[PDB]
């Protein structure tokens, strides 16, 4: 029951199909993105970043949430293909100027009060 | 010494030439651009000081940041600043450009253009009057008058 | 058309909140206490959600 | 009640046709515009000789902020924090404590001039005419930090500009 | 720790790191990176400068409000050094010139100035001093640059026994002289190399690696009196290195051997330029001299730094040296050069 | 009561009430509530499914002729199960009148795009997507309009922090503008201004 | 301004002589006046077209 | 006629103190007009008016050549006007300070200062409050 | 009422001066500290006590509408003087 209205997908199978289509599109786009933006990364790095961004949302079990995530990914892809993004926007995915925040207990206890 | 006198005189000549011909980029963001226009208007007539707007960044000497700088717009401001040939100067006009201003605590506003580019003169006001902007421009001229590049090169 | 989703609601992936501010945050749901300096009770009518207090320090300039 | 701006029909008589042909071939209206510019060339320009001449201002003008004193030399501010509460940009920071003689005075009074929108709400809110926006507007700096005013700087501004601030207030306090 | 110098915040721009650092030679190639890394975490940075203040403007956005303080200084004045190191718990020295002027020779910038800095900082109570010398610093090297580096290193150790000494080797970066120096020879048509560069081995290191190593050495409590050697992960023959450099820039590589005396004569001819010389005799000697091997000194990995290979960062320097035809070529299209390791 | 109090207009009130009854009678399938405010403004609360029918009627019926879309926006009320409240403001030049149409949605339920009814809706709908995250079905070109490229989240939501999560600055090492976690030299100072005494008895709620 | 001190601030002479005026000035410049609940769409003929506030 | 305009120019150069004073005013203010001396300032600035000019050009100041410490022959700015003459010069009032002197207080600055930015007298912000948390001071004697 | 700290730094009327070990003094080097000269506490202490023949007096700071809100001060205590909480002026009845 739960009386919900779909966006594009009725069950998860169609959601995974749309996810695979979007992943194909991003995988194909990565080399052109590296060429056009004159990025100093490799195509392997870009595809690894795409895979990591996709794997970030692997735990989702709601087809509507997956549908909205695919819509957002298509927005990002159309934004990259048309060069509406700049090199700064693409490079924001890599966090090159952020110092690595430690995750173990002792370093956190040393640096400050935040958990 | 003769060499020190010569470099001082050449330094003065170059400083006079640069301060007497300051070409701001035709570039405005928000409310402050209206007061910039009124500075260009006949009442104040910045052109009489040798200050002429030019659209192309390559033919400009000064960037007057006149208005709010947002996150979406900051890369464009940085880019047109980088395409200015040197020597180049930046004037931060208004509260929004100086420190964020009314929109300091906003998710989309850069808290001062000096996070993006180096700034030579800060002109307070929301907006500064056209007279205040003229005062800032003449202060920038005085600062250019103070600089000594040839003397520093000679004493190296 | 209805699809009969069986799962609990979860919108974390869509909200855009960094994960550090999703997992390590503790919220308090409470009706705020009446301010003891006044007798009015109009501020004790609604429920409030507020986050756990984090570090505040002194700015080296201007304090 | 409305009027039409472009609903007129040209006259089709031979004289009007010949006049329009003369306008087309001899450029009469272009010479009219040239005459307008030539007329402007012989007028006196509206430019003033800044900085030797200044633009007119008003006693209500809002410029650099200042903290004032009573004629005895005691400060007017009592640290009520009304200006801090009304400030739309949260540009005022205040800390207070009892003075050594028990007076209610500030220990910190900061105005961030790069946050301030120069709206004058603080001086409307002040019940003792302690904080004012003065007449000065030529206070551009070379660094961002020089525009972060503390209590000493504002007190200094008040001592420096009081002669003009009091005269400006005297000419406008009956409108307030 | 003097409560005002207790770390606070999340280590960002508005945070307090507890470091008050005076960075001599901050207006140079390495200085801008060092100051950027210091201002990233919320440090108080004091910048002594003798150049025109315009030449310092690029350092302004590197800190929060009030976190970067510019002061005029003179290398021959000890009162000025005292003035600029009075309130600092860290003093970093990066002063150096690849050529000699009429007012400052190698011994002034590499012996006298470092010794005065170390002595004044020891008098003032500065807790930490970082000094930068060269990997190839030797008392009897053919280059007076490295001889002066060795003498000044001994002087700094004498005047500040608890100083950390860092010995990098041929730093490369966007504003470096190393990669740009080899890429600029295309204007002469051919690349002159002594012995065709087959007798020279180089171990260049990334600029960000050196800056991170300096920052970590500041934050390392046991790195007090240690001496570090900052080197890259790979060693190359000079011929192979220059060939790779020209391959990344997509320029025709036409190397020819030039005898040592002829190259020295060319360096002397270029030395008479009143401006920054294109090359010098000392630069010629340093270019065709193999990088030393010092396995007994702690390296970048002992400071937690994993060295960045030149194959990952060469494009960011050499894409500017390409023509429009090859401007969009990707980084993995160049086939990394051969490394003579062990 | 005379000088400082806003005057009333009962004729406009009666006309708006009669027209609200008219609209409710014509479209019982979607109309849930009709209200006329004390300052003579007419509002119709409808079901989401009737977004396209209702509006079409209000634009095409000879007696409505609301041919102008003045504004379309959203309101966030986190306490409701349906978080978002979609508001259409319409103007009729023929009868010199204004009407408000309200409906509701939540984060995962899309709303029908009304660009086919009003071409003005296009950007408005995009804005609602950008500020609130409400998806509009069958929108010709739906994407961000106001926020920065790559911006995560929807700022106009009530739970979104005022200063956001990231800030921008130029970095000279990577030689570009970078985004980092937000740090404020002076934290925004939250004020608790609500008086503990009731101001308006006419809006008092039952004590539950 | 409207002669209603619970919305519009009193004059400074009244604020410095009357107790009610001082209380109303304090509360108006600290908390501000409360507005009864409700929603409005107000439009004017601004020089660039219809300008509205919801 | 044109001859009267030339005679006006000749009397303008004559009334500026001769030829060298004429050139001094021309190269110092880019203006050679003659006006009634409204007054003189204690720092050397002179204030003139001429009500026949249009509003804006009817009041002006010839700045001093020697301010507090700096040479202001060429380097002048509007910040050098003292507050009373500042009120008169910007037309906030019609009366000069000579005829309507400002009210005297013992805390008003007796020496006007100009804009001191970019100068060793520039304002440097700092916190004016005292320390909030006091740390415990360990005893100076051995514990055993 | 200015006075210098052992470091030679002026002490403001709030009493603030950087400690000996405080690095923040470096902001001051090659420049100056603002330090407003007039101390309001001393200036108000130099004012003479006013004598009035009434138990209750009124103060408004002078200037009428240009002063502070008008307050009433009781003068029944003979061991002290009535002090305005706004202006700082002191009042007393003719005693002894
Ligand atoms: C070739 C013809 C040029 C002759 C000319 O310019 O006559 C200007 C004379 C003044 O015209 P105007 O500017 O409309 O009158 C404003 C007052 O005269 C403004 O008069 P004033 O009170 O400002 O007096 C300032 C005085 C002197 O002011 C100056 O020192 C500036 C002029 C020096 C320029 C070199 O003016 C002159 O004498 C300059 C006149 C021409 C010299 C060039 O015009 C005529 O006499 C008509 C003759 C032909 C005009 C066509
Ligand atoms: C990064 O730093 C550096 C610089 O700064 C940006 C330089 O300019 C620089 C030198 C730059 C060169 C381009 C200077 C060479 C001068 C011209 C190319 C003319 C040389 C060619 C001939 C003399 C012209 C006529 C041809 C003859 C055969 C006759 C070097 C080496 C450098 O390393
Ligand atoms: C044969 C020629 C070969 C070279 C060709 C180049 C052209 C020759 C150079 C032209 C010289 C003209 C420049 C002199 C103008 C100075 C004007 C004066 O007013 O400036 C003063 C100060 O002047 C400068 O300090 C010095 C200027 C010149 C210094 C040395 C000149 C040496 C030139 C010799 C030729 C060298 C060429 C070498 C190549 C062959 C202060 O003015 P300023 O404060 O701003 O304005 C304030 C405005 N107010 C007054 C209204 C408030
Ligand atoms: N590949 C490399 O870069 C090699 C660097 N070396 C050492 O690393 C240090 C920094 O390197 P790098 O940044 O590339 O060198 P740079 O030439 O780029 O910068 C030198 C700095 O020292 C200052 N300076 C130089 N001479 C004087 C002087 N006589 N008086 C005052 N200041 C002076 C310069 O200031 P100003 O602008 O006024 O000239 C400048 O700020 C140097 O000590 C160098 O010897 C170590 C191995 C690698
Ligand atoms: S500072 Fe004020 S006037 Fe200038 S752009 Fe910002 S809001 Fe507009
Ligand atoms: S003028 Fe307005 S913005 Fe500025 S401090 Fe006063 S209240 Fe705040
Ligand atoms: S300046 Fe005025 S409003 Fe602000 S705290 Fe002082 S007395 Fe109150
Ligand atoms: Zn009083």
From TrEMBL, chain B:
Coiled coil residues, start to end: none
Free-text function comment from the UniProt entry: Core subunit of the mitochondrial membrane respiratory chain NADH dehydrogenase (Complex I) which catalyzes electron transfer from NADH through the respiratory chain, using ubiquinone as an electron acceptor. Essential for the catalytic activity of complex I.
Entry keywords, A to Z: 4Fe-4S, Iron, Iron-sulfur, Metal-binding, NAD, Nucleotide-binding
Species whose genome carries this gene: Sus scrofa (Pig)
Name by which UniProt lists this protein: NADH dehydrogenase [ubiquinone] iron-sulfur protein 7, mitochondrial
Lineage per the UniProt record: Eukaryota, Metazoa, Chordata, Craniata, Vertebrata
Binding of NADPH, residues: 156
Superkingdom of this protein's organism: Eukaryota
Cofactor list: [4Fe-4S] cluster
Complex formation: Core subunit of respiratory chain NADH dehydrogenase (Complex I) which is composed of 45 different subunits. This is a component of the iron-sulfur (IP) fragment of the enzyme.
Record carries keyword NAD: yes
Catalytic activity, as annotated: a ubiquinone + NADH + 5 H(+)(in) = a ubiquinol + NAD(+) + 4 H(+)(out)
Gene name, Swiss-Prot/TrEMBL: NDUFS7
Listed GO MF terms: 4 iron, 4 sulfur cluster binding; metal ion binding; NADH dehydrogenase (ubiquinone) activity; quinone binding
Binding site for [4Fe-4S] cluster: 31-32, 96, 126
Family: Belongs to the complex I 20 kDa subunit family.
TrEMBL record, chain F:
Entire-sequence positions represented here: 43 to 250 of 264
Oligomer and partners: Core subunit of respiratory chain NADH dehydrogenase (Complex I) which is composed of 45 different subunits. Interacts with NDUFAF3. Interacts with RAB5IF. Found in subcomplexes containing subunits NDUFS2, MT-ND1 and NDUFA13.
BP-aspect Gene Ontology terms: mitochondrial electron transport, NADH to ubiquinone; mitochondrial respiratory chain complex I assembly; reactive oxygen species metabolic process
Domain NADH:ubiquinone oxidoreductase 30kDa subunit, first and last residues per copy: 46-165
Record-level Gene Ontology MF annotations: NADH dehydrogenase (ubiquinone) activity; NADH dehydrogenase activity
Family statement: Belongs to the complex I 30 kDa subunit family.
Keyword Translocase: yes
Gene: NDUFS3
Name this protein carries in UniProt: NADH dehydrogenase [ubiquinone] iron-sulfur protein 3, mitochondrial
Catalysed conversion reaction: a ubiquinone + NADH + 5 H(+)(in) = a ubiquinol + NAD(+) + 4 H(+)(out)
One of the record's GO cellular component terms: respiratory chain complex I
Task performed by this protein: Core subunit of the mitochondrial membrane respiratory chain NADH dehydrogenase (Complex I) which catalyzes electron transfer from NADH through the respiratory chain, using ubiquinone as an electron acceptor. Essential for the catalytic activity and assembly of complex I.
Cellular location(s): Mitochondrion
Keywords noted in UniProt: NAD, Translocase, Transport, Ubiquinone
From TrEMBL, chain G:
Domain of life: Eukaryota
Family designation: Belongs to the complex I 49 kDa subunit family.
Subunit structure as annotated in this protein's UniProt entry: Core subunit of respiratory chain NADH dehydrogenase (Complex I) which is composed of 45 different subunits. Component of the iron-sulfur (IP) fragment of the enzyme. Interacts with NDUFAF3. Interacts with NDUFAF7. Interacts with CERS2.
Record protein name field: NADH dehydrogenase [ubiquinone] iron-sulfur protein 2, mitochondrial
Organism: Sus scrofa (Pig)
Range covered out of full length: 357 to 410 of 463
TrEMBL record, chain I:
Residue stretches making up the Zinc finger CHCC-type domain: 55-91
Domain of life: Eukaryota
Signal peptide residue numbers: none
Record's GO cellular component terms: mitochondrial inner membrane; respiratory chain complex I
Entry's localization field: Mitochondrion inner membrane
One Gene Ontology term from the biological process aspect of the record: muscle contraction
Keywords tagged on the record: Electron transport, Membrane, Metal-binding, Mitochondrion, Mitochondrion inner membrane, Respiratory chain, Transit peptide, Transport, Zinc
Binding site for Zn(2+): 59, 68, 84, 87
UniProt topology in membrane: Peripheral membrane protein
Role of this protein: Accessory subunit of the mitochondrial membrane respiratory chain NADH dehydrogenase (Complex I), that is believed not to be involved in catalysis. Complex I functions in the transfer of electrons from NADH to the respiratory chain. The immediate electron acceptor for the enzyme is believed to be ubiquinone.
Protein family per UniProt: Belongs to the complex I NDUFS6 subunit family.
Subunit structure: Mammalian complex I is composed of 45 different subunits. This is a component of the iron-sulfur (IP) fragment of the enzyme.
Protein name, per record: NADH dehydrogenase [ubiquinone] iron-sulfur protein 6, mitochondrial
Top-level taxonomy: Eukaryota, Metazoa, Chordata, Craniata, Vertebrata
Gene name of this polypeptide: NDUFS6
Residue range from the parent sequence: 28 to 123 of 123
């Amino acid at each position: 029951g739960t009386s919900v209205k779909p966006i594009f997908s009725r069950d998860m199978n169609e959601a995974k199909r749309r996810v695979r289509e979007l992943y194909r599109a991003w995988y194909r786009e990565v080399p052109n993105t590296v060429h056009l933006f004159q990025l100093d990364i490799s195509v392997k790095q870009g595809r690894d970043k795409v895979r990591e961004m996709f794997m970030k949302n692997a735990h989702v079990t709601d087809p509507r949430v997956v549908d909205l995530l695919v819509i957002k990914g298509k927005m990002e892809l159309e934004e990259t293909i048309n060069v509406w993004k700049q090199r700064t926007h693409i490079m924001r995915f890599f966090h090159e100027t952020e110092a690595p925040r430690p995750t173990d207990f002792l370093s956190k206890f040393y640096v400050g009060h935040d958990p | 010494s003769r060499g020190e006198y010569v470099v001082a005189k050449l330094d003065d000549l170059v400083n006079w030439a640069r301060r007497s011909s300051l070409w701001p980029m035709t570039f405005g963001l928000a409310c402050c651009a209206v007061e910039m226009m009124h500075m260009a208007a006949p009442r104040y007539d910045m052109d009489r000081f040798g200050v002429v707007f030019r659209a192309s960044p390559r033919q400009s000497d000064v960037m007057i940041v006149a208005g709010t700088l947002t996150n979406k717009m900051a890369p464009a401001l940085r880019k047109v600043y980088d395409q200015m040939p040197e020597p180049r100067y930046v004037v931060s006009m208004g509260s929004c450009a100086n420190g964020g201003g009314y929109y300091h605590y906003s998710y989309s506003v850069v808290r001062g253009c000096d996070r993006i580019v180096p700034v030579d003169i800060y002109v307070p006001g929301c907006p500064p009057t056209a007279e205040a902007l003229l005062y800032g421009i003449l202060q920038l001229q005085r600062k250019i008058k103070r600089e000594k590049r040839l003397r520093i090169w000679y004493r190296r | 058309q209805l699809i009969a989703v069986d799962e609990k609601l979860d919108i974390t992936t869509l909200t855009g909140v960094p994960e550090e501010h999703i997992k390590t945050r503790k919220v308090r749901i409470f009706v705020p206490a009446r301010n003891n300096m006044q007798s009015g009770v109009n501020n004790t009518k609604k429920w409030k959600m507020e986050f756990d207090t984090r570090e505040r320090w002194e700015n080296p300039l201007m304090g | 009640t409305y009027k039409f701006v472009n609903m007129r029909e040209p006259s089709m008589d031979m004289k009007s046709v010949t006049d329009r042909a003369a306008q087309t071939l001899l450029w009469t209206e272009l010479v009219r515009g040239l005459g307008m510019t030539l007329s402007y060339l012989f007028r006196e320009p509206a430019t003033i000789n800044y900085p030797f001449e200044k633009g007119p201002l008003s006693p209500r003008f809002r410029g650099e902020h200042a903290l004032r004193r009573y004629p005895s030399g005691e400060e007017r501010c009592i640290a009520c924090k009304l200006c801090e509460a009304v400030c739309p940009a949260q540009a005022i920071t205040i800390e207070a404590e009892p003075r050594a003689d028990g007076s209610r005075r500030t220990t910190r009074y900061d105005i961030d001039m790069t946050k301030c929108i120069y709206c004058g709400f603080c001086q409307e809110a002040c019940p003792v005419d302690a904080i004012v926006e003065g007449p000065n507007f030529e206070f551009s700096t070379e660094t961002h930090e020089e525009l972060l005013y503390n209590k000493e700087k504002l007190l200094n501004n008040g001592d420096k500009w009081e002669a003009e601030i009091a005269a400006n207030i005297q000419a406008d306090y009956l409108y307030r | 720790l003097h409560h005002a110098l207790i770390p606070h915040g999340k280590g960002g721009r508005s945070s307090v790191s507890g470091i008050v650092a005076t960075v001599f030679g901050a207006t140079g190639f390495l200085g801008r990176y060092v100051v950027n890394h210091l201002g990233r975490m919320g440090s108080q940075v004091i910048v002594p400068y003798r150049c025109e203040p315009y030449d310092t403007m690029h350092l302004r956005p590197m800190g929060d409000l009030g976190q970067i303080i510019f002061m005029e200084w003179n290398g021959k004045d000890k009162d000025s050094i005292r003035k600029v190191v009075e309130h600092s718990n860290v003093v970093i020295n990066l002063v150096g010139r690849e050529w000699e002027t009429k007012n400052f020779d190698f011994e002034d910038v590499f012996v006298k100035i470092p010794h005065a800095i170390a002595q004044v900082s020891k008098e003032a109570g500065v807790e930490k001093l970082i000094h930068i010398s060269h990997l190839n610093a030797d008392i009897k090297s053919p280059s007076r640059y490295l001889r002066s580096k060795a003498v000044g290193e001994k002087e700094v150790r004498a005047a500040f026994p608890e100083a950390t000494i860092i010995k990098p080797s041929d730093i490369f970066g966007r504003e470096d002289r190393f990669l740009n120096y080899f890429a600029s020879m295309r204007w002469f048509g051919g690349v002159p190399l002594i012995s065709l560069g087959k007798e020279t081995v180089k171990q260049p290191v990334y600029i960000v690696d050196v800056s991170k190593g300096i920052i970590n050495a500041i934050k390392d409590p046991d790195a007090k009196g240690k001496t570090f050697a900052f080197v890259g992960p790979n060693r190359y023959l000079l011929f192979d290195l220059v060939q790779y450099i020209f391959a990344v820039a997509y320029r025709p590589f036409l190397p020819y051997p030039l005898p040592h005396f002829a190259y020295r004569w060319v360096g002397r001819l270029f030395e008479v330029s009143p401006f920054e010389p294109w090359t010098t005799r000392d630069k010629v000697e340093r270019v065709h001299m193999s990088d030393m091997t010092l396995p007994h000194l702690p390296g970048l990995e002992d400071l937690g730094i994993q060295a960045t290979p030149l194959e990952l960062k060469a494009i960011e320097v050499l894409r500017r040296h390409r023509t429009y035809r090859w401007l969009t070529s990707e980084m993995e299209d160049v086939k990394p050069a051969k490394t003579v390791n062990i | 009561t005379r000088p400082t109090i806003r005057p009333r207009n009962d004729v406009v009130h009666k006309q708006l009430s009669a027209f609200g009854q008219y609209v409710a009678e014509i479209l019982p399938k979607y109309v849930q509530q009709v209200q006329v405010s004390c300052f003579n403004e007419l509002e119709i609360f409808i079901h989401p499914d009737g977004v396209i029918p209702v509006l079409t009627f209000l634009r095409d019926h000879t007696n409505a002729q609301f041919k102008s879309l003045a504004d379309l926006t959203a309101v966030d009320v986190p306490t409701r199960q349906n978080r978002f409240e979609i508001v259409y403001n319409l103007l009729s030049l023929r009868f010199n009148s204004r009407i408000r149409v309200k409906t509701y949605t939540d984060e995962l339920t899309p709303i029908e795009s009304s660009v086919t009814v009003y071409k003005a809706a296009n950007w408005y709908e995009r804005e609602i997507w950008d500020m609130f995250g409400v998806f509009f079905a069958n929108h010709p070109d739906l994407r961000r309009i106001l926020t920065d490229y790559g911006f995560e989240g929807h700022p106009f939501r009530k739970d979104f922090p005022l200063s956001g999560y990231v800030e921008l600055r130029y970095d000279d090492e990577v030689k570009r503008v970078v985004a980092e976690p937000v740090e404020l030299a002076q934290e925004f100072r939250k004020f608790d201004l609500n008086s503990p005494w009731e101001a308006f008895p006419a809006y008092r709620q039952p004590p539950e | 301004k409207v002669d209603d001190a619970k919305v519009s601030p009193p004059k400074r002479a009244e604020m410095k002589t009357s107790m009610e005026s001082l209380i109303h000035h304090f509360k108006l410049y600290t908390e501000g006046y409360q507005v009864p609940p409700g929603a409005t769409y107000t439009a004017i003929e601004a020089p660039k077209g219809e300008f509205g506030v919801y | 006629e044109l001859v009267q305009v030339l005679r006006r120019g000749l009397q303008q150069v004559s009334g500026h103190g001769g030829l060298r004073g004429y050139l001094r005013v021309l190269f110092r203010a880019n203006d050679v007009r003659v006006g009634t001396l409204v007054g003189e300032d204690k720092y050397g600035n002179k204030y003139y008016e001429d009500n026949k000019q249009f509003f804006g050009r009817h009041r002006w100041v010839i700045y001093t050549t020697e301010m507090n410490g700096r040479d202001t022959f060429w380097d002048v700015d509007g910040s050098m006007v003292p507050p009373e003459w500042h009120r008169w010069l910007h037309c906030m009032t019609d009366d000069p300070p000579t005829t309507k002197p400002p009210t005297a207080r013992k805390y008003i600055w007796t020496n006007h200062k100009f804009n001191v930015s970019g100068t060793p007298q520039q304002y440097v912000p700092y916190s004016t409050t005292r320390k909030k948390i006091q740390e415990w001071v360990p005893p100076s004697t051995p514990y055993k | 009422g200015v006075r210098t700290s052992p470091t030679g730094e002026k002490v403001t009327h709030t009493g603030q001066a950087y400690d000996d070990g405080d690095y923040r003094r470096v902001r001051f080097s090659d420049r100056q500290k603002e330090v407003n000269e007039n101390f309001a506490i001393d200036l108000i202490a130099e004012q003479p006590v006013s004598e009035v023949g009434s138990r209750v007096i009124s103060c408004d700071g002078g200037g009428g509408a240009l002063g502070h809100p008008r307050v009433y001060i009781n003068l029944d205590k003979e061991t002290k003087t009535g002090t305005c909480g706004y202006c700082g002026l002191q009042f007393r009845q003719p005693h002894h």
